[PDB]
Amino acid sequence: PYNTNQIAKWLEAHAKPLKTTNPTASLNDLKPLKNMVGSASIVGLGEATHGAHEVFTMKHRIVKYLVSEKGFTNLVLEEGWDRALELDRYVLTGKGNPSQHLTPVFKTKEMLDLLDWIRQYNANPKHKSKVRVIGMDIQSVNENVYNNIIEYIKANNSKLLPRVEEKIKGLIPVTKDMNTFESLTKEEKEKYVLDAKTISALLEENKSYLNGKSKEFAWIKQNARIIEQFTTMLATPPDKPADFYLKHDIAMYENAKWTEEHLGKTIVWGHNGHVSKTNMLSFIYPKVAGQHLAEYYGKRYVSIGTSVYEGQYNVKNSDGEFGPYGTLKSDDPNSYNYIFGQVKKDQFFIDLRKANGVTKTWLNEQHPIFAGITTEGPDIPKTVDISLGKAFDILVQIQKVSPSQVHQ
Ligand SMILES: [Ca+2]
């Protein structure tokens, strides 16, 4: 019968102290991460919640470390693939207005500082590599995605445009948002699902007449893949309600995999529930992106999760408004939050894969942990059971958080 008070002492002796959560502070305290990450090709970096300032800034510091010390060149955000096309343009050319395309919950100062740092890093002649910004989410398929396909066909094989031109013209108005598409008739969604399949099929058979062995054709093909991901996910029949979510994270997984496979060492930035190696969002998801990633990459995928203890965070209230209405209550002494919360350090990280004794056993058992869902409601659990040692390879604990600095 292990003693959780002793476990908290073992954690203290093996915890790597984090000096600050300030993005501009020295990266020296992150050095222990070099060997923890090792030669992994893709690292999941989760956020305990989407509404905490310190969580965002600490993740910013890690990206910084991974980019300048471990060769990572791609940041995949839990953001729409279409919206990120504009964020990528911003960090590449400095042109555009980032906050205009960021999802509402991410329209924050921390997010804009992260993007600005990436923009700066990319314009510095001393770095022999640039960081690309990709979006793995598909809550919509705006017109910019369609124009990429239109533009590439017009330029490489304009003769093919007729076969695609208004399949996309009809798809544009119904993919502007999930509500428009799901509010369609069963027969309608299926026709659009076919229109998307056809567009992708068209690019595939005319591969040789479109400079198919190139890296730009790879991009185009993926852009078309996004349309299929969106249409298929929302064409899910009512007799299989769980498939909406299964397909959702299968797509995010595919987009994160596509990035690593075509662009290199990648960083998957998203919620703890989407990068964990086990399903902690089982109350809605049959499987999450992180399980597909671990399943395909094995030791090539490293999963880092963040955890909290005390403080306040932004969350949507009983009226559905996003604000500083979240208050952490790590009252339960059996939860990972309370236990890691007893470590006498403001911030620290640790390699869960290196745990020994009872701590190792305890990490492989199911225990309560703050869920961090963006909405607070009667049917939304505030905590969920999870095996920390199975969900994450590395844990970063931040004892006190405050609300993200959401634009006003
Ligand atoms: Ca999320």
The CATH architecture assigned to 69-140 reads 2-Layer Sandwich (3.30)
Classify residue 71 as left (phi > 0), alpha (psi -120 to 50) or beta.
left
Beta-bridged to residue 175, according to DSSP, are: none
Phi, psi of 131 (to 5 degrees): -100, 125
For residues 123 and 92, what is the distance between their CA atoms, to the nearest angstrom? 8
Alpha-carbon distance 105 to 322, whole Å? 7
Q: How many A from CA of 312 to the centre of ligand 1?
A: 18
Instruction: Compute, in angstroms, the gap from residue 78 CA to the centroid of ligand 1.
Output: 7
β strands within 48-172, DSSP E: 74-80, 132-137
Distance 27 CA to ligand 1 centre (A): 27
- What is the structure's resolution, reported in angstroms to one decimal? 2.3
> Side chain identity at 370, as an amino acid letter?
F
Paired strand residues for 398: 308, 347
Give the pair of three-digit tokens for residue 341: 């919360």
* Centre of ligand 1 from the C-alpha of residue 23, in Å: 22
Distance 125 CA to ligand 1 centre (A): 35
- Give the Cα separation of 154 and 161 in Å (integer): 6
Cα–Cα distances (Å) from 2 to 7, 51, 299, 343, in that order, read 8, 34, 30, 18
Residue type, 323: G
Distance of CA 105 from the midpoint of ligand 1 (Å): 9
Backbone angles phi, psi at 352, to 5 degrees: -65, -25
Spacing, Cα 13 to ligand 1 middle (Å): 33
Q: Of 265, 256, 258, which Cα lies nearest the Cα of 71?
A: 265
Q: Is 50 annotated as a binding residue?
A: yes
Torsion of CA 210, 212, 213, 219, to 10 degrees: 110
Q: Tokens standing for 152?
A: 């590439």
Report which of 268, 353, 350 is spatially closest to residue 307, judged by C-alpha positions.
Answer: 350
Q: What are phi and psi of 325, to 5 degrees?
A: -105, 5
Give the span between the Cα atoms of 210 and 153, in whole angstroms: 7
Q: Which of 374, 372, 392, 391 has the alpha carbon at shortest distance from 383?
A: 372
Helix segments in 162-287, DSSP class H: 162-171, 178-182, 186-205, 215-233, 243-263, 272-275
Closest CA to 312 of 19, 55, 20, 23: 55
For 141-267, CATH gives 1.20.1440.30
Q: Are strands 367-370 and 383-386 parallel, antiparallel or unpaired?
A: antiparallel
- How many residues appear in the chain? 408
User: Separation of 270 CA from ligand 1 center, angstroms?
Assistant: 7
Distance 274 CA to ligand 1 centre (A): 8
Rg from Cα positions in the chain: 22
Helix (H) or strand (E) holding 315: strand 301-316
Beta pairing, strands 347-351 & 394-401? antiparallel
Tell me the CA–centroid distance for residue 348 and ligand 1, in Å: 24
Q: Are 235 and 39 in contact (CB under 8 A)?
A: no
- Cα of 9 vs centre of ligand 1, distance in Å, is 33
Ligand 1 centre and the CA of 316: distance in Å?
13
Facing residues of 303 across strands?
Answer: 44
Distance (angstroms) between ligand 1 centre and the Cα of 177 equals 17
Q: Are 325 and 376 in contact (CB under 8 A)?
A: yes
- Dihedral, 74, 80, 86, 87 alpha carbons, nearest 10: -50
Q: How far apart are CA 171 and CA 88, in angstroms?
A: 24
- CA dist., res. 173 & res. 90, Å (int): 26
Structural tokens at position 243: 């498939």
Q: Delimit the domains of the chain by residue range.
A: 1-68+268-408, 69-140, 141-267
SS3 breakdown of the chain: % helix, strand, coil, rounded to 5?
Answer: 50, 20, 30
* Rounded Cα–Cα distance for residues 349 and 112 (Å): 25
**Residue 45 burial by CB count (10 A; 0-12/13-18/19+): exposed, middle or buried?**
buried
Q: Looking at domain 1-68+268-408, which CATH architecture does it have?
A: 3-Layer(aba) Sandwich (3.40)
Angle at 324 between CA 369 and CA 333, to 5 degrees: 25
**49 C-alpha to ligand 1 centroid (Å):** 8
What is the longest distance spanned by two Cα atoms in the chain? 73
In terms of DSSP H, where are the helices of 234-356?
243-263, 272-275, 289-297, 336-341
Number of other CB atoms surrounding residue 56 within 10 Å: 26
Whole-angstrom distance, CA of residue 251 vs CA of residue 301: 17
Q: Which pairing describes strands 347-351 and 16-18: parallel, antiparallel, or unpaired?
A: antiparallel
Nearest 5 degrees, angle CA 248-CA 383-CA 374? Answer: 50
In contact, 180 and 173? CB cutoff 8 Å: yes
CA of residue 396 to ligand 1 center, whole Å: 19
Q: How far apart are CA 152 and CA 109, in angstroms?
A: 35
8 Å CB contact between 175 and 231? yes
State the CB neighbour count (10 A cutoff) for residue 42. Answer: 25
